[PDB]
Amino acid sequence: ECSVDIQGNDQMQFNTNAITVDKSCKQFTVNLSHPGNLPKNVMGHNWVLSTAADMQGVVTDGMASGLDKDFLKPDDSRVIAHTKLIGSGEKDSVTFDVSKLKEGEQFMAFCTFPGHSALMKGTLTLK
Ligand SMILES: [Cu+2]
């Protein structure tokens, strides 16, 4: 129980707004998929993890980075883990070390495609 399957869809939502990572896990894996019909340049989604304090800067700088950079500032030290940006019918996975998390803190998981984090934002918590 050290992975989660996340979908981002044409309605600009992930399937979850709260991810729990079992603290017995040494690594955690997010398997993102896009069950919609819309292409990456219209309704692209990524899955990006940061602290709550860093989310807004990652989102804003991501928009400024452009589609060709997956709407994610390259080499952003604030990004704990992230997938690539995907469109309809694609999938992407990322694994990260659970040592990057700590109990008692709600981390933020979000998409940086412009506008999406109005809905595509939620918490991740080690329990
Ligand atoms: Cu998105």
UniProtKB/Swiss-Prot annotation:
- Residue pairs linked by disulfide bridges in the UniProt entry: 2-25
- Which Gene3D superfamilies does the entry link to? Cupredoxins - blue copper proteins
Q: List residues of the Plastocyanin-like domain.
A: 1-127
> What are the GO MF terms of this UniProt record?
copper ion binding; electron transfer activity; identical protein binding; transition metal ion binding; zinc ion binding
The UniProt function text for this chain reads: Transfers electrons from cytochrome c551 to cytochrome oxidase.
Q: Which NCBIfam families match?
A: azurin
Q: What is this protein called?
A: Azurin
Which organism is this protein's natural source?
A: Pseudomonas aeruginosa (strain ATCC 15692 / DSM 22644 / CIP 104116 / JCM 14847 / LMG 12228 / 1C / PRS 101 / PAO1)
Taxonomy of origin reads: Bacteria, Pseudomonadati, Pseudomonadota, Gammaproteobacteria, Pseudomonadales
